[PDB]
Design a binder for this molecule. Structure first.
Ligand SMILES: Cc1cnccc1-c1cc(C(F)(F)F)cc2[nH]ncc12
Ligand SMILES: [Mn+2]
Ligand SMILES: [Mn+2]
Length: 368
C-alpha cells in the first residue's frame, strides 16, 4: 500500500504493523558544566522508561506523518486567487482522510489557521468570509492532527513574493534555534533569549523599507498535554520565566517574527473556541446552550474547534448559545491576534518530545 496523489490513503494503512516513522532524533544540549547528555541514549533506566511510553510516542508519530503528507499536498496547490475558505476546506478534507478521523480517538486537533499579513495567529474563516489569498500575502498555515489526544501542533508560512524570503528565513532559523536550545532541565527564559538573539540578527527590506525582525513578545511556545493544546508551561520568544522543562514533557516550539511593533492585540471576528480544560461539569437548562455544549462535548471535548466546524455538523443559530458558553466560562474564545496595520508576520512551529533517551522533533520533515 502506497499513498495516492492527491493523498487519500490513511496513514495507518500505509504502516499495517502499527509502527510509524520517528521524527528527527537529537541528543540533548550539554549542561552548564559543559557535560554531555549523551549518557541518556545508552542508559538502562532511560531506555526502559522510553519503551514504557512507546504507544504514546508512536501515536504522535502517526499524527506527525499525517501532518507531513497533508502539508506537502497543500504547498503544491495553495495559490493566490483561492478563497481562505477553499484553502481551509481542502486542507481539512485531506487531513480527515489521512488521520482516519474517528470521533475523539483520531481527528483534527484544532482549526486550520491561515492568518494573513499583520495577523499572526488564530484566524480561520467563519462562514460567508469572502477573503481571497493575494500574491503579496504572507500566510501562516498552522494545523493540528491527533491520535488519542496526542497532538501535533505544526506550522509554516506561505508566500509567493520573494520579497519576504529573508523574513521567513529569520523565523525558520529562530524556530530551529529554540528547538536546538530546548531540552530536559533547560530554563524557558534561556530558550526565549536564544530565540530572540537569532531572530534579531536579521534585517529585511520590504518595498524600500528596512526592519530588524522582532519576535512577537506576547506569543509563545507551550507544553502539550493530552487533548490539551496548551498544558500550562509557556516558552518565551524574548529575553522571560526561569522555570525549567522536564523529562517526558511535550512542547510546541513556535516563533513569530514581525516587521510591526512585535506585539499582538485581539482583532477581527472570533472563529476559534475551546472548552476550558479545568471547567468541571456544569448543569445547563437553557435548551440551545445545553444542546451546543453537548455537541461540543461529543465532538471536540477539550480540543479547540471553530464555527465552520459547527456549520458542518449541521448546527445553525448557535451564536447566542456559544456566547453564553463563553460568558459562563465553560468555553473560551480565541480571537485572531494581530500586530499593527501594515506589518508582516511569519511563523514556524514544530512539536518536540522530551523523551528520556533523546529529543525528538517528531513533526520534522524534508520541507522544514
Ligand atoms: C490555549 C492557548 C493558551 N495560550 C496560548 C495559546 C493557546 C492556543 C490556542 C489555540 C486555539 F486557539 F485553537 F485554542 C491553538 C494553539 N496552538 N498553539 C497554542 C494555542
Ligand atoms: Mn500551532
Ligand atoms: Mn502552538
Amino acid at each position: 500500500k502506497v499513498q495516492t496523489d492527491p493523498p487519500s490513503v490513511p496513514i495507518c494503512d500505509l504502516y499495517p504493523n502499527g509502527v510509524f516513522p520517528k521524527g528527527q532524533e537529537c541528543e540533548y544540549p550539554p549542561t552548564q558544566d559543559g557535560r554531555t547528555a549523551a549518557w541518556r541514549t545508552t542508559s538502562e533506566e532511560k531506555k526502559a522508561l522510553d519503551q514504557a511510553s512507546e504507544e504514546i510516542w508512536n501515536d504522535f508519530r502517526e499524527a506527525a506523518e499525517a501532518h507531513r503528507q497533508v502539508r506537502k499536498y497543500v504547498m503544491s496547490w495553495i495559490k493566490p486567487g483561492m478563497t481562505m475558505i477553499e484553502i481551509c476546506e481542502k486542507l481539512e478534507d485531506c487531513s480527515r482522510k489521512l488521520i482516519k478521523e474517528n470521533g475523539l480517538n483520531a481527528g483534527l486537533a484544532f482549526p486550520t489557521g491561515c492568518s494573513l499579513n499583520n495577523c499572526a495567529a488564530h484566524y480561520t474563516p467563519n462562514a460567508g468570509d469572502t477573503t481571497v489569498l493575494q500574491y503579496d500575502d504572507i500566510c501562516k498555515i498552522d494545523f493540528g492532527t491527533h491520535i488519542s489526544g496526542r497532538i501535533i501542533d505544526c506550522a509554516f508560512t506561505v508566500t509567493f513574493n520573494p520579497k519576504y524570503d529573508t523574513l521567513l528565513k529569520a523565523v525558520k532559523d529562530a524556530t530551529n534555534t529554540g528547538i536546538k536550545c530546548a531540552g530536559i532541565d533547560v530554563r524557558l527564559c534561556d530558550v526565549g533569549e536564544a530565540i530572540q538573539e537569532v531572530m534579531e540578527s536579521y534585517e529585511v527590506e520590504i518595498d524600500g523599507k528596512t526592519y530588524q525582525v522582532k519576535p512577537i513578545r506576547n506569543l509563545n511556545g507551550h507544553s502539550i498535554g493530552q487533548y490539551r493544546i496548551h498544558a500550562g508551561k509557556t516558552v518565551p520568544i524574548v529575553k522571560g520565566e526561569a522555570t525549567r522543562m522536564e523529562e517526558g514533557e511535550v512542547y510546541a516550539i513556535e516563533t513569530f517574527g514581525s516587521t510591526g511593533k512585535g506585539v499582538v492585540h485581539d482583532d477581527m471576528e472570533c472563529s476559534h473556541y475551546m472548552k476550558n480544560f479545568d471547567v468541571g461539569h456544569v448543569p445547563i437548562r437553557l435548551p440551545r446552550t445545553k444542546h451546543l455544549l453537548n455537541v461540543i462535548n461529543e465532538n471536540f471535548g477539550t480540543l479547540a474547534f471553530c464555527r465552520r466546524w459547527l456549520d458542518r455538523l449541521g448546527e445553525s443559530k448557535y451564536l447566542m448559545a456559544l456566547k453564553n458558553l463563553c460568558d459562563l466560562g465553560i468555553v473560551d474564545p480565541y480571537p485572531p491576534l494581530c500586530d499593527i496595520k501594515g506589518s508582516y508576520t511569519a511563523q514556524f512551529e514544530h512539536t518536540i518530545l522530551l523523551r528520556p533517551t533523546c529529543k525528538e522533533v517528531v513533526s520534522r520533515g524534508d520541507d522544514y
